[PDB]
């Protein structure tokens, strides 16, 4: 049970606030409510656990490591690629891509989806009649 724990080196997703969608690394624990997080593109600061969603990724680091050490550990663990390839991480990227689509792109996607739906319906009907 409890597949995920808050740990030194645990990678978490910010699920609320202005920093939503960013990956951070838990480098220390202040108390039961907040921890010390870090990432390559921010300053190590505290965050409440209520704004963090633990991921399945973990890196091997000591508490409050240097920026270079943290970056090296993240690169060795390939955190970015692992998160992006996972369905959970791909979900946010796909949501952003859908939000970014323009009118002509939306029309082309509609055409492609209609054609695929028609072909799939024909295929399924043939399978059923088989």
């Amino acid at each position: 049970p409890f597949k995920r724990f808050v740990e030194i080196g645990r990678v978490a997703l910010v699920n609320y606030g202005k920093d939503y969608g960013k990956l951070v690394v838990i480098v220390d624990v202040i108390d039961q409510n907040r921890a010390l997080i870090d990432a390559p593109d921010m300053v190590r600061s505290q965050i409440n656990f209520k704004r963090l969603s633990l991921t399945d990724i973990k890196i091997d680091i000591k508490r409050i490591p240097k920026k270079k050490t943290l970056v090296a550990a993240m690169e060795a663990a390939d955190v970015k690629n692992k998160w992006e390839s996972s369905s959970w991480g791909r979900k946010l990227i796909v949501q952003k891509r859908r939000a970014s689509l323009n009118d002509f792109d939306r029309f082309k996607l509609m055409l492609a989806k209609i054609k695929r739906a028609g072909v799939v319906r024909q295929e399924l009907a043939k399978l059923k009649k088989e």
Partner: peptide, 15 residues
């Protein structure tokens, strides 16, 4: 080696 699960997490949309 401090380790514990997030017993209480509140569910809400990003905004």
């Amino acid at each position: 080696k401090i380790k514990f699960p997030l017993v209480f997490k509140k569910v809400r949309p990003p905004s």
